[PDB]
Design a protein around this motif. Sequence first.
Motif, short mmCIF file in Angstrom:
data_model
loop_
_atom_site.label_atom_id
_atom_site.label_comp_id
_atom_site.label_asym_id
_atom_site.label_seq_id
_atom_site.Cartn_x
_atom_site.Cartn_y
_atom_site.Cartn_z
N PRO A 1 1.97 6.86 -0.56
CA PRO A 1 1.12 5.80 -1.10
C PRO A 1 1.62 5.38 -2.48
CG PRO A 1 0.13 7.88 -1.55
CD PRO A 1 1.30 8.17 -0.63
N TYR A 2 1.53 4.10 -2.80
CA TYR A 2 1.96 3.65 -4.12
C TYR A 2 0.93 4.16 -5.13
CZ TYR A 2 3.00 0.54 -8.08
OH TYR A 2 3.28 0.02 -9.33
N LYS A 3 1.40 4.88 -6.14
CA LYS A 3 0.51 5.43 -7.15
C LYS A 3 0.86 4.93 -8.54
CE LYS A 3 -2.16 6.60 -5.86
NZ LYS A 3 -3.61 6.93 -5.83
N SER B 1 0.78 -1.23 0.00
CA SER B 1 0.00 0.00 0.00
C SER B 1 0.81 1.28 0.00
CB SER B 1 -0.95 0.02 1.20
OG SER B 1 -2.07 -0.80 0.97
N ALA C 1 -3.73 -6.08 -7.92
CA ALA C 1 -4.82 -5.69 -8.79
C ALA C 1 -5.65 -4.52 -8.25
CB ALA C 1 -5.72 -6.88 -9.03
N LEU C 2 -5.60 -4.30 -6.94
CA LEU C 2 -6.39 -3.23 -6.33
C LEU C 2 -5.64 -1.92 -6.15
CD1 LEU C 2 -8.09 -5.23 -3.41
CD2 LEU C 2 -8.97 -4.84 -5.73
N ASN C 3 -4.33 -1.95 -6.34
CA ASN C 3 -3.50 -0.77 -6.14
C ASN C 3 -3.50 0.26 -7.26
OD1 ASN C 3 -1.58 1.05 -5.16
ND2 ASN C 3 -0.29 -0.60 -4.33
N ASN C 4 -4.11 1.41 -7.01
CA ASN C 4 -4.15 2.47 -8.01
C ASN C 4 -3.26 3.63 -7.57
OD1 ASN C 4 -6.42 1.11 -9.44
ND2 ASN C 4 -7.57 1.75 -7.61
N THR D 1 -1.13 -5.50 -0.16
CA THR D 1 -2.43 -5.47 -0.82
C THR D 1 -2.37 -6.30 -2.08
OG1 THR D 1 -4.03 -4.04 -1.98
CG2 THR D 1 -1.70 -3.47 -2.15
N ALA D 2 -3.52 -6.78 -2.55
CA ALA D 2 -3.53 -7.54 -3.80
C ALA D 2 -3.17 -6.47 -4.83
CB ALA D 2 -4.91 -8.09 -4.06
#
Lengths: 196, 196, 196, 196, 196, 196
Positions: free
Chosen positions: B134-136, B44, B193-196, B190-191
């Motif tokens: 946060p990872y963006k 995350s 695929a959910l990281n935006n 976090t999975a």
Amino acid sequence: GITVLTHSELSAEIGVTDSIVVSSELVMPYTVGTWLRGVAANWSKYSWLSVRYTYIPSCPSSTAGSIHMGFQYDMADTVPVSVNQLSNLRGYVSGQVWSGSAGLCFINGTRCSDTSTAISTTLDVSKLGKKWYPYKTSADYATAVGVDVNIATPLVPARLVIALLDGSSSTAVAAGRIYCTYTIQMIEPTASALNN
Amino acid sequence: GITVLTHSELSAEIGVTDSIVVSSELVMPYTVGTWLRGVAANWSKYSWLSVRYTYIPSCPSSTAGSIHMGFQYDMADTVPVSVNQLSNLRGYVSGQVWSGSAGLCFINGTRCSDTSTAISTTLDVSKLGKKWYPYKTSADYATAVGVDVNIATPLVPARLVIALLDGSSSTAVAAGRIYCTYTIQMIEPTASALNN
Amino acid sequence: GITVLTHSELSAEIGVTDSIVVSSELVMPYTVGTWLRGVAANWSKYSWLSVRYTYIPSCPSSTAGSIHMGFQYDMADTVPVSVNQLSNLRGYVSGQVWSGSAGLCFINGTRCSDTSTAISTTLDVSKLGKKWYPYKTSADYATAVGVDVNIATPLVPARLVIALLDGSSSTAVAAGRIYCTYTIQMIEPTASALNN
Amino acid sequence: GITVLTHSELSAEIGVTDSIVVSSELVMPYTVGTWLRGVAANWSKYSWLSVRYTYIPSCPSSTAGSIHMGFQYDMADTVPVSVNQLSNLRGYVSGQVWSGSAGLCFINGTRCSDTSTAISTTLDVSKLGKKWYPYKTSADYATAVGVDVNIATPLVPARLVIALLDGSSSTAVAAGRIYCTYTIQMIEPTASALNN
Amino acid sequence: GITVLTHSELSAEIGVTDSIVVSSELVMPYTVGTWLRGVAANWSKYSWLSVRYTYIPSCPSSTAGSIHMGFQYDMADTVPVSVNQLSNLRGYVSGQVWSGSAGLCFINGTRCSDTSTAISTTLDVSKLGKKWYPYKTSADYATAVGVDVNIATPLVPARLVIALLDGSSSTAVAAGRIYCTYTIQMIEPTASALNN
Amino acid sequence: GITVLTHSELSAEIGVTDSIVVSSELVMPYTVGTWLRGVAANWSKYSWLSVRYTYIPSCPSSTAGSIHMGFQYDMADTVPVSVNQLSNLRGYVSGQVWSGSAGLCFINGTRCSDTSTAISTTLDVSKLGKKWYPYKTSADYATAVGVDVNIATPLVPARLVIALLDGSSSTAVAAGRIYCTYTIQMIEPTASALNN
Ligand SMILES: [Ca+2]
Ligand SMILES: [Ca+2]
Ligand SMILES: [Ca+2]
Ligand SMILES: [Ca+2]
Ligand SMILES: [Ca+2]
Ligand SMILES: [Ca+2]
């Protein structure tokens, strides 16, 4: 790579009327004063080691009126509209429009004892959202909060709200002025022309 | 719950022309390189313990041109347009397009002495707005700054600006490449695929 | 009331021809670079804790030419006209127009060993006429020395003379540039608009 | 061969009007006061161990007006024209034209605590161009700066700028006076008649 | 980078008449003597660690006349016109034109006791305007003071005034000579041809 | 100026169905519960020293269903849609809808040993974007994220995602509830009416 600087400077001219007048000023390099504004622009970010707004009178002892100051930290919060509300704020100070001479001690940098009467207040600094803030210009900041006020919390640490009332005239009477004394750490230099 | 990782990776291919060309890259997991991009997405947030961009040449000693690098921290600030302006930045480095071999030391992880000539620069890290970012993803970040640039300061710590000039041709000549060496702390998985 | 600052910045672009060309630059805040010029103007006087001019190449190893630097302290003294005379000066340095990469070490602020080859030189600082000099502007300084050159010694600590020759063309060929790295103490602030 | 002397003396009479009035005085033996002027003339050079200008009121508490003081060090710099600019200066002090009684402490030489309110300011002394200055007379100094202002920096350490405004009349109203308290070291005696 | 040198040398030939004759000499490398003049020219600036002018007689014990010496530090000050005025100066010495043999001790460099009678005097050195002065030539200095005398204080530390009277003839009678013994620190070398 | 408070309170009522249902709640004073919502509004900013959501059952041991909880930190990240994805989150906990009684220990504040079975989870707190967050209201927050989700990271530290499935009915069956236990530091008081 820190450049530490301690300096006092004029922040605002003050006048009093018989009806309350509330105003606020952002607590960032660009708005505290013309001097620091020009200096800090040469650095990318900064940090407040100490920031204090102190009121100095310039009127007769017979001048009617009182001055009030305090801090707010969420620019989204609505500004106080009464002395009562303002008195709840952090760093709230109150005094006669002709009192406050003792505050000179802080500006001059000199060491003094009789400060009780000083209409001066200092910022938490250690309780601000973060330590290093980016140098911003009114215009840029204005546009940001134009989109949404909350975009401001990561751009500015706090605002100083001021209230003036108890005056004897409906027409402002020059009472004195607010000076800002600060110790700021400036980092990551930049050509000033590029700093927005 | 910290997962610390130290790794070097290719960041950008570099070419030179006879006219100055300025560019910049965000200093966040997603954009430093393809490898870290895929890895960090599984967490995350992250923190930079160390981030260094180092230029390594791949051309003949007879190749004309020079490379320039520096950091900016307020994405709202306008990007430098001249070597002069760029030279004012934090971590500014300059060198011949065919120099910089000594920088290999940092990439390889090995310990070395003769670093004087290295066209390599490191980030403040301790002077960034905050520690945990946060990872963006480019897309998400792009949309955000599309609304207002300032929305970026709480999303990315800094950008690396690069300038190339003094080349002998108007058509880019491959000079070398910039590698990124970092020690990143990744937290709160976090999975991906959910990281935006 | 001292504000100490350490920073590197671009000072001059350098070119070479087949005939010797001698030039000099004053070693004062206003003339070292555009950045410091704007910053220092906000203070009345300053002191050099450290000032170093270092040459960084940007040309091919095949580029013909050599660069020469040294210091002079009595602006009334006539400027050198030959490498021979220049070699007698304090802090004299000489090198191939394509050498000097090792000097990056000093600019970057980083610690390095392989400095032997660096075309970089530093000022006495402790042997200057005095410690605290007044911030001056070209115009004001110009007028002063216009009356008499000696009026300059109490206004500026020294001048850096530069010589370029051994080039292969009669038309200047961009060789590299001189950067100034300094640690300056600035005192007695003033509104910049008033500083002459 | 040093002759140390500590003494207080009248420096200037002060009056206030409703429009700002800015003035300045050189900080050298000859101009601080009539007493020291006559004494110091018997020595070739001097040094300021301590120099402080302190304002003492003589008006009613009902008197409108404020006084402002600060220092400048490069006589070539233009004199402030507004309270704002003046507030940026070193040793800036501000106060009501009827305040400042606490400053008596410094003049009397006595030890005191309640100094907060004192409209008094002291010179850097340790940050002046040099330590030993030559005793000068107005006439001689005048002629020198007539040729070029810069000829002044090696003749005088600083100037005290004063500003008075916020008065209730367009016709000056006697507010009080500025006294100078100093500890001066005088060296190399001379027949006073020869001292220019 | 200091080159320290201690040496004695002839400074002036002395003669006496029955009417007072006052003269002065600058206390700078160029004017103390022909030897030091040529040597010091190879350095940009210098500092006096010690400078002493000592009078040595060459006449019979029956020779009428007396010699007088002292120092002045503000070249703008007018030169003494009487023994009385001269006696007030720093380092004032007086003696019979045929006395002073004991001063040889200082010149020879040897250690001696019976110095009471020596017509010798030494400079403050530690009380001079500054420590490091620029090497100047008569011509250059002359032009400077031609514009304004005060331009001299930052160019020369002091002047030695001399007075001769009580002689028995209206036509000068060779009495003796003044030698200068000094310990000078020379810094920042330069090709002598460029030193003005 | 810190006001520390430790308290437990009801956060949400929980029900189960035979199909998975995912939901999330912001982890800020305003949304954890009605009590803290009213209290914290009297302060400008706050910090979480400890925040734990713990599930307490209220159904028979024969009740079908399971509950799942975890944290997310970038509100821009998409919410999990499956137990699998949710299990990757920080602080993930899972248990039978009728288990979790042992979690009472944490709520009651009492000290206990048999916690293995507790369906309770705690926030990083030390790994949050920052320490001091501004007190926000749903409405204000809603508008902000309406402009762009990322405007949220500087307004809220994290969100708690919850998933319920494995139930025996398609119609929710009351299983139990989630209580929030926290130790919050509240700073910079304000009239609640002004806090947005
Ligand atoms: Ca900015
Ligand atoms: Ca994310
Ligand atoms: Ca100036
Ligand atoms: Ca004099
Ligand atoms: Ca010279
Ligand atoms: Ca709020």
